[PDB]
Design a protein around this ligand. Structure first.
Ligand SMILES: CC[C@@H]1C[C@]1(NC(=O)[C@@H]1C[C@@H]2CN1C(=O)[C@H](C(C)(C)C)NC(=O)OCC(C)(C)CCCCc1cccc3c1CN(C3)C(=O)O2)C(=O)NS(=O)(=O)C1CC1
Ligand SMILES: [Zn+2]
Length: 193
């Protein structure tokens, strides 16, 4: 047996004045696309909603690279119009993986603002205010149950300008309440690159 490819099943629309999620592919289609690695669907935007046979999470475009977490993706190839695409970046120590950004997608610019007022984008297209607390952490202004954040790993942390500050990695949870988030800083990405 072989593991399937990661498959783009949707995206987070941040184009207009309203953030909302869009599904671009259903479950049977996903199942098939994962097996073949052949995905002919048009890709749009910065924030992709992705899937394996077993898990669903997010993937983010930064500097022409579609980024996600190792815990979600493993070493899996990504489904594309011309077949499975091998990872160009793999880092288990950082819970980080990357593939060449798919044609049609748009990439976010790495932040150079040195600013601590951030915004987390969830799988549900919720825009969550986060205050930066260190190189890798940030507190939620309004804490949420873990449930609310689940499946958002691989999504972005944005600055007020819209620059990418980082990739959501793990939640800081106490007795099911998430008071903070842990992320992969964009500098780590730039370094990997
Ligand atoms: C539910 C929303 C969570 C965002 C999310 N991530 C996770 O679920 C990750 C996956 C796993 C656990 N975890 C946690 O968030 C846990 C938690 C809440 C489950 C209890 N937090 C924790 O241990 O904090 C503790 C903390 C000290 C802050 C960790 C810092 C170091 C973190 C770290 C550094 C380097 C490597 C690795 C890690 C952590 N890491 C590998 C790893 O494999 O973590 C997700 O949404 N996942 S998902 O559902 O989309 C999945 C399908 C893809
Ligand atoms: Zn910025």
């Amino acid at each position: 047996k072989k593991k399937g490819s990661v498959v783009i099943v949707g995206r987070i629309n941040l184009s207009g004045d309203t953030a909302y999620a869009q599904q671009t592919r259903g479950e049977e289609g996903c199942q098939e696309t994962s097996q073949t690695g052949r995905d002919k669907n048009q890709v749009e935007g910065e924030v992709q909603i992705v899937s394996t046979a077993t898990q669903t999470f997010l993937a983010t475009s930064i500097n022409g690279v579609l980024w996600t977490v190792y815990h979600g993706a493993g070493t899996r190839t990504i489904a594309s119009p011309k077949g499975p695409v091998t990872q160009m970046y793999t880092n288990v120590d950082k819970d980080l993986v990357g593939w060449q950004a798919p044609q049609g997608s748009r990439s976010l610019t790495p932040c150079t603002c040195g600013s601590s007022d951030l915004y987390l984008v969830t799988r549900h297209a919720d825009v969550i205010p986060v205050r930066r607390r260190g190189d890798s952490t940030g507190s939620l202004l309004s804490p949420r149950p873990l449930s609310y954040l689940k499946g958002s790993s691989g999504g972005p942390l944005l600055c007020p300008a819209g620059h990418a500050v980082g990739i959501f990695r793990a939640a800081v949870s106490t007795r099911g309440v998430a008071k903070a988030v842990q992320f992969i800083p964009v500098e780590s990405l730039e370094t990997t690159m």
